[PDB]
Design brief:
It is classed as isomerase. Keywords: 4 oxalocrotonate tautomerase family, tautomerase, isomerase. The assembly is hexameric. The entry is titled "Crystal structure of TomN, a 4-Oxalocrotonate Tautomerase homologue in Tomaymycin biosynthetic pathway". 6 copies of one chain form a homohexamer. In chain A, helix 1 links the parallel strand 1 (2-8) and strand 2 (39-45). Chain A is built from 2 helices and 4 strands; from the N terminus they run E-H-E-E-E-H. Chain A is α+β, with helices and mostly antiparallel strands and 63 residues long. Chain A has a single domain, classed as Macrophage Migration Inhibitory Factor (2-Layer Sandwich). Chains in contact: A-B, A-D, A-F, B-C, B-E, C-D, C-E, D-F, E-F. Strand 3 (50-52) of chain D pairs antiparallel with strand 2 of chain F, so a sheet runs across the interface.
Chain lengths: 63, 65, 65, 63, 65, 63
């Protein structure tokens, strides 16, 4: 199973490593997939490049 | 955050619903993100359109021994 | 540039055609890119395969009150 | 509605912010989606990593 | 590595199988990656959902002269 | 035809340029697509952000 998670920049090394373990466990538990068959990519996006309601997360945090 | 999952066709509806919930719990506990801020999109690919080693999952299934 | 849109199933053909045009005009005006250099791909997801808060759009629709 | 735009690196901060506003307006106008329901990610790609006709945009600009 | 291809609908099964193999050989020779480490996912888009210049491939096909 | 290749960071400039040429040739050969109609994006992912079996490629290399 392939999993891509896109989230905001600024996460700790712990958080990214934890996320990759935990998403893998979730797929293994719910689908029966061997853990080695679960592949995860974490993509981090700067807050100036993520918009909700037409305003960036960087602006929404400021305003 | 956005979680996009690519799976082979043929999982049951109950397994897909359980996966959505469990991936969401995993992002909640590890990142602190509220569950309502986590989105999951599950895409299913037919086995003729997924290749490993240059051969489709369908072809690899037809010769596994 | 490439614009990939993910939408729930059920939009009309006319709305999808109008979206493609309008996203293209938006990229043209803001970036200067010629319209012919903008590509848009629209993907439709069934509501059983889109989750928010760990529950599918289908499940959230079945209990909205 | 979720929108991912991939474009070449080197855009100004104005251009990215403008793009996120304008794509959001387009989705709101054409689908009736509340602006808060439109989410946009802008991904920027270095010109050495985008190919057309088997040559990078960086090479095509040089040559 | 992961190779995701987006194609218009309508290619034959034989062409899609040949593409998967050939993209895999290309990644093997240029990167050194073993073939079994290369995955290819082929996605097909209907021509009403692919836009260039703000018009769908279907619309551009209906007026090409 | 559009092709996105995600692979690990650390590739040489030769390797990325070669990959973009070779993937383009493969699409041209197998589909009959004019080379100018083949578009390729190469995305590079740090090894700490790619997981197999719940462990990052960075950890798997160390351990």
């Amino acid at each position: 199973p392939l999993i891509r998670v896109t989230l905001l920049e600024g996460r700790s090394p712990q958080e990214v490593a934890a996320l990759g373990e935990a998403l893998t466990a979730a797929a293994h538990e719910t689908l029966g997939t061997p853990v080695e068959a679960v592949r995860v990519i974490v993509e981090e996006t700067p807050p100036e490049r993520w918009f909700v309601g037409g305003r960036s997360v960087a602006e929404r945090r400021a305003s």
